[PDB]
Amino acid sequence: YRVLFYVDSEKLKQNDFNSVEEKKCKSSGWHFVVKFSSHGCKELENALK
């Protein structure tokens, strides 16, 4: 009475997360009747999982 049982259990888990966010805003105004105004912002956001 012989018995031979082989079990090969394998589990693999891998997870990667990366997020990049960059925001830059620049505004300049000069007046000397003369009036000048400039306003502009930029926003960038990215996320991957």
Q: Which of 29, 31, 32, 41 binds other proteins (CB under 8 A)?
A: 41
- Binding pattern to other proteins, positions 20-39, x when CB under 8 A? -------------------x
46: contact with other proteins by CB under 8 A:
yes
Residues 6+ apart with CB under 8 A from 41: 23, 24, 25, 27
48: contact with other proteins by CB under 8 A:
yes
43: contact with other proteins by CB under 8 A:
yes
